[PDB]
Amino acid sequence: GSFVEMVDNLRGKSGQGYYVEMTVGSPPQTLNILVDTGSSNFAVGAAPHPFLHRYYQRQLSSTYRDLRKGVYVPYTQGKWEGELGTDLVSIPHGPNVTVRANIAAITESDKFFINGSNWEGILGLAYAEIARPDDSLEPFFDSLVKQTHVPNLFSLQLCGAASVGGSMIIGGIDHSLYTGSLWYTPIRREWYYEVIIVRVEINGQDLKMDCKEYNYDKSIVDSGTTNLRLPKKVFEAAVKSIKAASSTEKFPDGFWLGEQLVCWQAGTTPWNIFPVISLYLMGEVTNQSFRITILPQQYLRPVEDVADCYKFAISQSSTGTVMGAVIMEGFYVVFDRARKRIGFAVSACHVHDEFRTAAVEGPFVTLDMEDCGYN
Numbered sequence: 001g002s003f004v005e006m007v008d009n010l011r012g013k014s015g016q017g018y019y020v021e022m023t024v025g026s027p028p029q030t031l032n033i034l035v036d037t038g039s040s041n042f043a044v045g046a047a048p049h050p051f052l053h054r055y056y057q058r059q060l061s062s063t064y065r066d067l068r069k070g071v072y073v074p075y076t077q078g079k080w081e082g083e084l085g086t087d088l089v090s091i092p093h094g095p096n097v098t099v100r101a102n103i104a105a106i107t108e109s110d111k112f113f114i115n116g117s118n119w120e121g122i123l124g125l126a127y128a129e130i131a132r133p134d135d136s137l138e139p140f141f142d143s144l145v146k147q148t149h150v151p152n153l154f155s156l157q158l159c160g161a162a163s164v165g166g167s168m169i170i171g172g173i174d175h176s177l178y179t180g181s182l183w184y185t186p187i188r189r190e191w192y193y194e195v196i197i198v199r200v201e202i203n204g205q206d207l208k209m210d211c212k213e214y215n216y217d218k219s220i221v222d223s224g225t226t227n228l229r230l231p232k233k234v235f236e237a238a239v240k241s242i243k244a245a246s247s248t249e250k251f252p253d254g255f256w257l258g259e260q261l262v263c264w265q266a267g268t269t270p271w272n273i274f275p276v277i278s279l280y281l282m283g284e285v286t287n288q289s290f291r292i293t294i295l296p297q298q299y300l301r302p303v304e305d306v307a308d309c310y311k312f313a314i315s316q317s318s319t320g321t322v323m324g325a326v327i328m329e330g331f332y333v334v335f336d337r338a339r340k341r342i343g344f345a346v347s348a349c350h351v352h353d354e355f356r357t358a359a360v361e362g363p364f365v366t367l368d369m370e371d372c373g374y375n
């Protein structure tokens with residue numbers, strides 16, 4: 001109910017993600033680690049990459065154990081490769097416990113770390129299924145729950161903007177971080193945090209799409225992604241409707257594609273011309289759904305580094321819907337692993353104005369929600 005030690009344990013810069021402090025090895029080596037619900041490895045920088053403030057030094061730890069196994073993780077942009085081991089892991093502003101966890105010691109990477117950022121590793125909070133190299137590599141949170149009496153649950157309050165903050169409550173919920181009620185959507189399958197979107201509204205106007213399109217080929221909740229990413233077909237329909245609703249002002253085609261910024265004189269941004277975005281999610285009960293609603297304050301991201309400018313952070317995807325920071329910053333989100341469900345509630349810290357607020361509302365009646373999931 002109240003975990004005062006863990007409130008405000010997240011830091012970050014706008015655009016660079018949310019990180020928590022962790023210690024690895026004996027004696028403890030302090031590192032800043034990206035909180036990532038879209039991956040399942042605990043992967044830390046372990047060599048002196050010039051971009052990194054700090055890195056894991058295995059030679060300094062008496063509790064380090066080599067698994068004698070390498071891992072190689074490519075993607076379209078670049079890669080990371082590491083050496084698998086285990087060591088003792090602790091979270092200073094988390095539960096008072098010490099865990100033997102898997103660590104991928106990153107020894108070479110490309111386009112992985114961010115130049116100028118204050119984190120040097122990633123905490124993959126998703127499930128074993130998508131761990132590299134395979135599901136035999138037990139994820140951190142699985143190790144934490146197996147080795148301690150920490151409840152099988154964590155919650156995230158990501159507070160948007162140059163210095164963002166928030167809370168990762170590990171093993172529970174802090175009721176001060178949200179208003180109103182939590183509403184829960186089932187975790188469809190334990191790999192990513194997969195969920196089912198059953199309906200999409202732009203300013204109350206239904207997009208009227210076959211709800212299967214909203215989840216093609218999956219919908220996930222991902223704190224390790226900035227944007228609200230929408231399947232191509234859905235993105236297309238959504239921007240068409242956002243354009244119509246905001247047609248009072250015109251903007252270049254590049255703005256809606258994230259290829260270009262738009263700027264207003266300081267303090268004059270016309271939030272009111274931009275529509276709210278509502279996602280209905282599958283509820284706990286047969287034929288029952290609920291709705292989450294975000295403002296332009298979530299999807300128009302301030303860009304400080306130019307030479308009041310904003311980027312459109314709803315973008316097209318071929319990996320399905322990703323509910324990134326654009327969604328999560330509106331809400332306190334409860335990753336209730338024990339009950340295979342994810343809870344949403346209005347965040348006590350979300351950015352809004354005097355006219356509109358982020359919202360979690362229900363119940364609604366939605367039929368054939370099971371047909372919305374992709375096979």
Ligand SMILES: CC#C[C@@]1(c2cc(NC(=O)c3ccc(C#N)cn3)ccc2F)CCOC(N)=N1
Nearest residue numbers: 015016017038039112122222223224225226325
């Ligand atoms: C292993 C791993 C991983 C990644 C991954 C994520 C990131 N995140 C970020 O830089 C980031 C995160 C949040 C916000 C925000 N707000 C801004 N920036 C960087 C490198 C990665 F390889 C792969 C792509 O997707 C996810 N989920 N995890």
